[PDB]
Amino acid sequence: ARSFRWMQAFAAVKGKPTAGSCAAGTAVVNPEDPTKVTLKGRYTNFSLQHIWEKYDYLQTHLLLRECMLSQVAKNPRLLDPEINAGLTPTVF
């Protein structure tokens, strides 16, 4: 249960919106000096948000994969719980 503290923490933040479904920036003009204008936000060279809003999770997913690979190069016995539970596709 306290081991699944972190599962509860993850499930808490589930459908919170991201920058992948919207524009990455917005302009604000200084009202006292309209010549002055600031861009609040991030960089982006990307405009296919109407597609990426569905696969937004893949970046962190692939990061997690690369990190599981790093951990497993040292110890491959960390997945045995899930293998025994039968979540993965395995042919006993």
Partner: protein, 188 residues
């Protein structure tokens, strides 16, 4: 009919927050200002550079981002190149998420990117590895060659032969429409 929602609190949040730092045991691994460059934090500073210093003597700008490992690898040799050649050029260090309008200006599409600039369009050479074949030394060699080229061309023909091009009349408005405010044009 095409639209994108305006923005979100996440998008407008701080792109560069702080993260925890480890104790001095994780640092112990097998593989274990700067007085010559300028870290740029503001599009005001970037514009001042590009429109005055880049007309006086050339500039070399490194556009990076924190997520990239190639930037971390390329940082130190870039600092050595700066320490070598700061007499002939100025050297700047820009983060794309902190100053995106500088990245849109230089037309950078991938990170890390070197940009050699003189006259703001008289000489603009972008060096990068869109494929993933080059290395940091290759990038620095290309940057040295480009810097030599632009210096030679500025000396060529009595200081002339390096005049600005399309920015003479475009003002980078097709690249970034927010320059209309700088030019004072209406938006009504």
């Amino acid at each position: 009919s095409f639209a994108i929602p305006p923005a979100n609190a996440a998008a407008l949040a701080d792109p560069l927050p702080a993260t925890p730092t480890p104790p001095p045991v994780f640092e112990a691994v097998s593989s274990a200002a700067l007085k010559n460059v300028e870290e740029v934090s503001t599009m005001e500073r970037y514009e001042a550079a590009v429109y005055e210093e880049s007309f006086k003597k050339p500039i070399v700008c490194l556009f990076f981002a924190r997520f990239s490992l190639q930037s971390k690898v390329l940082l130190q040799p870039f600092l050595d190149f700066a320490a070598s050649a700061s007499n002939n050029a100025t050297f700047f260090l820009i983060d794309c998420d902190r100053v995106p309008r500088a990245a849109y200006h230089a037309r950078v599409e991938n990170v890390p990117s070197l940009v050699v600039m003189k006259g703001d369009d008289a000489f603009r050479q972008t060096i990068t590895d869109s494929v993933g074949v080059k290395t940091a030394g290759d990038l620095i060699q290309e940057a040295r060659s480009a810097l030599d080229q632009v210096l030679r061309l500025d000396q060529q023909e009595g200081g002339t032969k390096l005049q600005p091009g399309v920015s003479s009349y475009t003002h980078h408005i097709g690249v970034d429409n927010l320059n209309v405010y700088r030019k004072g044009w209406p938006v009504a």
